[PDB]
Symmetry: C4
Subunit: 362 residues, 4 copies
């Protein structure tokens, strides 16, 4: 089973940042030796649609569809609830198809009654016949506060089974569906990043909420490579040539914030510390997303995951403290330096740095 195999390869093989980069090493937060605040007044609260959350971080969707997967969703959800952190579940297709797969998603809401919970379906489902009703069912199954629709064409190109399909018709349908839905749609990538062209196209169809999921964290091309190697599939060697395919997370954050200045933006793909999260937010994200390190702690257990979030939160407040940022808003506006390849990326892409400074700050 593909869902089990995915979790096992992500958690126990070497695919985190494999031959790829976030370009976050190119972003420096300027240290403020006179912060102007004290540690105890640092306020980490922010908005997440109609709800308030305790920390500008979310867990992005990963799993569900059978009981061992549901027990990972349970650990993640009950810890996220405790910490006031939003949580996306993984793809719900399996539970649209099979009633026994429902509980492994529903459990999330039982144990996390108050945080934002975000449903999940894949864009390809929209050209294979999914419509309003499947979306409402994904949403109602966990009383979702939003639904994420994922883009994973890279993964689909290199996986043994099948071929990606991304006709514009899917966007027409998406646009129709968003007018009848009572919760917002977020469009997220899954390891390879969102460019300006893709963010503007999505915007022209009514999409305002993005999750970057850039290269440099979980490498889904590497994951499929490993599944190909395991079955002696021919594609393995081709996947290896594409290991560094994608938009780096930090470049993707800049590209979505610049091309759609009023977007609500999750910066994710390789966020591994509260310092990475602070960088993502100062660059222009509204919140930082994480998947893989949450998975690996959850598999270790509830208390491991509690420790993990304590660490992320401390690191984030440390960066806020050391930049003079009393709250999330001030963090979005703090002083940064951009160097090296990220800077060359932006310049070639016509990202005028002065208008960038202005846009990331309002």
């Amino acid at each position: 089973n593909r869902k089990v195999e995915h979790v096992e390869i992500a958690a126990f093989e070497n695919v985190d940042g494999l031959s790829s980069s976030t370009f976050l090493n190119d972003v420096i937060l300027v240290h403020q030796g006179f912060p102007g605040i004290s540690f105890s007044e640092i306020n980490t609260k922010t908005k997440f649609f109609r709800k308030e959350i305790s920390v500008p971080v979310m867990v992005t969707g990963m799993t569900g569809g059978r009981n061992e997967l549901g027990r990972i969703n349970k650990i993640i959800a009950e810890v996220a609830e405790k910490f006031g952190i939003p949580m996306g579940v993984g793809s719900q297709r399996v539970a649209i198809e099979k009633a026994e797969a429902r509980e492994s998603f529903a459990i999330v809401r039982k144990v996390a009654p108050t945080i934002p919970i975000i449903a999940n379906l894949g864009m390809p489902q929209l050209v294979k016949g999914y419509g309003l009703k499947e979306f409402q069912d994904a949403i109602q199954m966990i009383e979702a506060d939003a639904i994420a629709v994922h883009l994973n064409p890279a993964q689909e190109v290199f996986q043994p089974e099948g071929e990606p399909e991304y006709q514009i018709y899917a966007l027409e349908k998406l646009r129709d569906i968003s007018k009848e839905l009572s919760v917002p749609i977020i469009v997220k990538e899954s390891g390879n990043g969102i460019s300006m062209e893709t963010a503007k196209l999505l915007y022209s169809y009514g999409i305002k909420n993005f999750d970057t999921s850039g290269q440099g964290g979980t490498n889904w091309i590497a994951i499929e490579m490993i599944r190909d190697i395991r079955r002696g599939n021919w594609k393995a060697e081709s996947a290896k040539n594409f290991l560094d395919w994608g938009v780096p997370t930090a470049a993707s954050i800049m590209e979505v914030r610049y091309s759609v200045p009023d977007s609500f933006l999750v910066g994710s793909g390789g966020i591994r510390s509260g310092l990475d999260a602070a960088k993502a937010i100062a660059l222009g994200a509204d919140i930082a997303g994480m998947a893989l390190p949450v998975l690996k702690s959850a598999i270790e257990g509830k208390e491991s995951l509690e420790q993990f979030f304590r660490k992320i939160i401390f690191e984030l407040k440390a960066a806020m403290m050391l930049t003079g940022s009393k709250d999330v808003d001030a963090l979005k506006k703090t002083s940064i330096v951009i160097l090296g390849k990220l800077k060359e990326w932006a310049e070639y892409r016509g990202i005028n740095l002065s208008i960038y400074e202005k846009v990331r700050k309002r």
Copy 2:
């Protein structure tokens, strides 16, 4: 025999990218998380002079002149025919001189009756007396659809036997010949690349078709170095100092497309994957060329070469799919980023990046 030794050194020694670079690591194709197409509608067909080809890739000229060499030409040709891929043969000098060497070229047309076949003579033959008749004989011997005239002065400088000769008279003669020939001439390098000054000089004599053959692939200075080492020739240590001599393929593509915007352009030299080929094309080439990796697979056998092309084609379509490029024309216009040394090369050479963008996409 030099032809045999050449093939043996290229195939079995360490001379592929030896101390050299294509600069293709400096070209990035911008990933499109919503491609807007489906994998099965990707069309790879393109024009090659008066014929249509199935994939925008060619095999560039390598060998011929005796029976063991002819059997390599046979394998390559019958596989290229099967895949709808054009094929250049190696230098036909030896078959102009000796009737017995003819069959080792002619076999290409016997087993490949439909694809473009490209004949081959060296530029120095033009100052050693070759004229119209030798060109017509090269062409007729394989019913060629075109003839390539090669520039290899770097190789000639370091080889033990003789000295390069490139007087302008050769171009006058080339110019005369091209008005009496019923097929087009392509001018190609052989490892060291074509600059703007050389492309403009060639153009001023009526040459419109170029094949970059840049540094970063097969290193012909290294091949000669090794021939020198083998014979204890003094020049070996001098060849070693020139290992990184030449214009990197990526820079050569930019230089030719910029200095001659209506050229028909083969991007070649170090093309090892369908992703290299995609980059070569997006940069400004009309098609990608390959020699060495085709040689090494052909030596292994028919089925090894068939598998090799399946892999190149898949990698190419993967890059087209992940950039939203439904056909070769879309690929020539797709978004890219250029960074690092390639970017510094272009700036010092006066290649205004904005006018470059415009020129590479019409």
Copy 3:
């Protein structure tokens, strides 16, 4: 005891430049093959407030607070006096609180009657009740010629005990204090550097004297990381994520000189040779500071520390000789080159290099 532990970790663990950089490798002094002077006329004297000092180098504050610490202060003070070099003592808070800790500071003046001596208290003390009287007591204890107020929020974030406090009220108080004090105030960092924003805020409260204490020297985040590891404190792994936090010394010198052109500036944090000292001054510092390498020599003994200063002074004169700088003033105006990351830092931070050149030369 924290003071003892600090000295032992700084002196005997690996924390000097740990994962951090001064960016001084990006500063090059232009060699002058015809210096225009002779070695023996080189004059290293310069002003330090109302006194004249023999060398434009100071020892910045480190220790004090018990007898073994006082014996280190004594060695450093008596050598500094012999060389005509100013000396800052470490934080005097402990001697405000406990009369027995006083002698370990006062010994500095007994043994060094003429050189400038610089008192020390931490900025957080100002929001914890310290004011005029404690400042006058720190000064009188050693008949100080100045008092340094230190910023160490990074160190405080990562240390096991407590939390940093840097409300603006501290600056209000500092500003009132400075009007009743009879010696100047210097504000220094302690390993993480001073930015333009912090220098400007400090300036707007009447502070004119700065000591950069940039990253790339003693890494106080690493020191607290090590104290955390030793106690099995959870923060250790978070400290490790921040090892390269802060403004590099060279960038901090540029930022302070640019944002406050008339400041009196100590360039410190990783000054390890007379060449680093020459670099700091040519970049815009008025004098170079050192802490750690003086400590390590002092622990070895009086004669070890004498040899250390002889080496620093020789290296500084060598750099003056090789740039044609007859005095400290000529050195501040000598030709330099700025390359690589320091150059990209300055550009992103809006430090126009031409106005920089003008400002650092006046």
Copy 4:
């Protein structure tokens, strides 16, 4: 004896390029696949003051002063005469002071009656009482066609014995002397390079002929470091800190040619192949100088040195052939690329690349 030790350290210890760089890796000669010439027509002749020389390369001054040194001067001189190559002798101070040292210089003219021979005294001699008469004696001793006056302040700073003296009076005297001398003066560095400031100051005193001697070849600071280590002298560690002190040869060539456009320029310091020599000349030098590798071959024997010059000349013609440069003039004008640190050096130093292109081409 210092002369013997210097030769032994340079020839047999690791001091060539030690921790230093020429920046010539940053200069690329553009390859021309159609050279437009043939190898046998390449002409390497050029002027050297009033004489003609066969190759635009010289041996810069090294040794003399006793019989074993004289025998090295004899091998180098007789080979240079055979090849049509100018030769500078090392410092003649010892032969001004002691009549027995004379023959070890004079032998150069006996064995090389036609090529330019360049006499040698140090700049500090001019403030130590040398004047016209000592200059005429240096010149007459070998019937010199020119005299080189060397700048070696870096070497003097770090050597155990003494101190450097470069008062302006030396230039006043030099300026007087050049008006009574019947041959030209060349001012050369010796490992640390010539800047714009130094070139302009020299020029204002009537100096028109320069030899860059930049960092990246023989490292005179390292040589003195090694002499210090051997005697347990304290300066050793200080010398180690200055190993990368100086203007890289490539940068010095650009600085002298830009700041003094009509100068006659020897580009030297780390020239190790005829490709380095071609780079030096294309950058703006009129000729390339070499010292160290000539010494090492001469110590091996007459036939070793003859083979060395054959290698250098072949490499130089190869680079001329591969750039379409039929003569030394065309080479000075051929297409280049400048990248990386050399490019950043030039930009910070105000060397406008477009006016540079113009100036190096006349």
